């Protein structure tokens, strides 16, 4: 019978958080339950973790310890606003609900009807983005670009990109193709960040061919009845 050390089980504890946040698809949790009984006197089950996540991001209000509890190895707690949720295999710098001005998550359990599709150019220039769901800022003196995503419920897919996601929920690196993963928090429904920032460094020649695929959302007023309308088309935005 092999038991985890304090730091070993903590990484797996964070590994479980990352998996539940949906920032990772893999975990190592062999030995985590015994490590919670011994070091926390608790059952480390899925219910426990979703409330740790719920409290840390939305609901908790005092100071928190490294294991995301609010007011033995972890009876000490932090005044600063973040924990480094670091499993060893992956890490994310996550800010507590306490540290922000209000709530910077949005509820995506809500129904909204599908933004109707309407034709548009397959390739969109980075410097003339007409979609409302993201906004680009270019820093030629640092040869960096930042893409602000204003509608995170609308997918942004990365291809051959190597970026840093910045947001008021968590900050983390992404290194693989596909839809940008975001922290998912359950609180009478599923919440994701209300806005996030994709930071792309051109000094790193490894994203020489970084390109973004997204649903370009167009906001309009239909002239006949005077009401606001939303439409979308698939488009690619090339960087570098
Ligand atoms: C997140 O959105 C969901 C879905 O809109 C909310 O869940 C519903 O909440 C209402 C009350 O506001 C209940 O009457 C419904 O039964 C719930 N479920 C469904 C399927 O509609 C949820 O309350 C929202 N969460 C927050 C924190 O506002
Ligand atoms: C970004 O990637 C996601 C999947 O990672 C794409 O969503 C798929 O869209 C097709 C057609 O709409 C569906 O048949 C699949 O079931 C979807 N997959 C998932 C997991 O939802 C999305 O279309 C991609 N975006 C762009 C602009 O290409």
From TrEMBL:
Location of this chain's protein in the cell: Host Golgi apparatus membrane; Host endoplasmic reticulum membrane; Virion membrane
Domain GP38 nairovirus as annotated: residue spans: 16-239
Family: Belongs to the nairovirus envelope glycoprotein family.
This protein's name: Envelopment polyprotein
Organism annotation: Orthonairovirus haemorrhagiae
């Amino acid at each position: 019978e092999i038991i985890l050390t304090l730091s070993q089980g903590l990484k797996k504890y964070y590994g479980k958080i990352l998996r539940l946040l949906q920032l990772t698809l893999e975990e190592d949790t062999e030995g985590l339950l015994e490590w919670c009984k011994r070091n926390l006197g608790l059952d480390c089950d899925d219910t426990f973790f979703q409330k740790r996540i719920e409290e840390f991001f939305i609901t908790g209000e005092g100071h928190f310890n490294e294991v995301l509890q609010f007011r033995e190895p972890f009876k000490s707690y932090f005044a600063k606003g973040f924990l480094s949720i670091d499993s060893g295999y992956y890490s994310a710098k996550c800010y507590s609900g306490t540290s922000n001005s209000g709530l910077q998550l949005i509820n995506i359990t809500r129904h909204s009807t599908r933004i109707v599709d309407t034709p548009g150019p397959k390739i969109t220039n980075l410097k003339t983005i007409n979609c409302i769901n993201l906004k680009a800022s270019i820093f030629k003196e640092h040869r960096e670009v930042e893409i602000n995503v204003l509608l995170p419920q609308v997918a942004v897919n990365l291809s051959n990109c190597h970026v840093v996601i910045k947001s008021h929920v968590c900050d983390y690196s992404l290194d693989i193709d596909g839809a940008v993963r975001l922290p998912h928090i359950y609180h009478e429904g599923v919440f994701i960040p209300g806005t996030y920032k994709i930071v792309i460094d051109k000094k790193n020649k490894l994203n020489d061919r970084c390109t973004l695929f997204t649903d370009c959302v167009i906001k309009g007023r239909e002239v006949r009845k005077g009401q606001s309308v939303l439409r979308q088309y698939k488009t690619e935005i090339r960087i570098g």
